[PDB]
Write a protein that binds this ligand. Sequence first.
Ligand SMILES: Nc1nc2c(ncn2[C@@H]2O[C@H](COP(=O)(O)OP(=O)(O)O)[C@@H](O)[C@H]2O)c(=O)[nH]1
Ligand SMILES: [Mg+2]
Ligand SMILES: [Zn+2]
Lengths: 34, 202
Amino acid sequence: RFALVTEGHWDCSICLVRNEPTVSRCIACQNTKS
Amino acid sequence: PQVQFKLVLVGDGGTGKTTFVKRHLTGESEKKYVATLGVEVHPLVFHTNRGPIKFNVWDTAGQEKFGGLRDGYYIQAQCAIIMFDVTSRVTYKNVPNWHRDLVRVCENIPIVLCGNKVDIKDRKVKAKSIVFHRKKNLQYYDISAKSNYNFEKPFLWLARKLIGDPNLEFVAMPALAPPEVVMDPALAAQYEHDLEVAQTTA
Ligand SMILES: Nc1nc2c(ncn2[C@@H]2O[C@H](COP(=O)(O)OP(=O)(O)O)[C@@H](O)[C@H]2O)c(=O)[nH]1
Ligand SMILES: [Mg+2]
Ligand SMILES: [Zn+2]
């Protein structure tokens, strides 16, 4: 099967954007990593 | 964690963006409000032959009626839908402006163009006009949010581009709010015919 494939990278709890481990604020909505 | 894409849904006010995204029942019940940007993010799951895909659709709170949207709305957008109203020519005329804004902050993300409200007899923007101004890399679909007509097609096209798999399929339709108006099959057959002839015309 070729099922779609999915480390400090975090999904914003507010807007769901995936953010780099280097940042602590969401690059899109500026809320802070929980 | 899951396969998901940020999808920005843009277009003039009153074209049906909110009505359209809301057809996906689970995406509505699980939507998330971003207070800092005035956005409702709808997580829309679609089940493909290779597993589930989530389009996190960013829906405005009407701010588009008064000016441009802030950069945060577009940041990390991986795909987009540009919507206009077939019963209002000005919404089509503004399509290139939305396109420009998207490419400024997002560049060559896959984009689908949707002409909404095709359930209305008195259509004004017709297949001839849209196919004459067809732009490469910009797939188009007729849609009717209130009737669920062609609801899945923008998302299927985007999923194929994003995954890079021309043979991706949805194995089942998502649970959609029951149609509030009927899409007359005759109009559907006509608009579909008008679109095919206009695309294969010599
Ligand atoms: N007949 C018909 N009416 C629609 C459709 N979509 C929206 N409408 C109406 O267009 C008006 C604006 O809808 P809305 O979703 O708020 O557009 P938005 O401002 O872009 O979010 C509303 O009165 C809708 O009921 C459609 O697909 N068919
Ligand atoms: Mg709206
Ligand atoms: Zn965020």
